[PDB]
């Protein structure tokens, strides 16, 4: 039913990426953080558990409107922007699934990062 309006999402070029890792063409989504993310950090995000994140297949899930609104209204784009406002420009992004871990830890349940304001 909305498998279209995923697919449109997922054009966006900051969707092209993993929000944490930046792997290309990720297929997974935490829809209330509204994040498009890798399989391997989908898996990082279910260990945060639902109080944190909320994982969905882009297509093998079903999604609820609301759901989807949640991306719409969001996006790695806009989520760098609040997540990742304190991110030292310096800063080595992860790639390894121990330090991948800590990173999504310290990004949404420690709100390291995040511009508050936001
Ligand atoms: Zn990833």
């Known amino acids: 039913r909305y498998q279209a309006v995923l697919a449109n999402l997922l054009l966006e070029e900051d969707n092209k990426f993993c929000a944490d890792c930046q792997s290309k063409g990720p297929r ?54 609040l997540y990742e406002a304190y991110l030292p420009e310096t800063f080595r992004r992860p790639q390894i699934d121990p330090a991948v871990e800590g990173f999504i830890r310290d990004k949404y349940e420690k709100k390291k990062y995040m511009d508050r304001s936001l």
């Open 28 to 81: 997974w989504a935490s829809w209330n953080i509204g994040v498009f993310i890798c399989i391997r950090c989908a898996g990082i995000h279910r260990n945060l558990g639902v109080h944190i994140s909320r994982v969905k297949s882009v297509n093998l899930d079903q999604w609820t409107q609301e759901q989807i609104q949640c991306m719409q209204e969001m996006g790695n784009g806009k989520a760098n922007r």
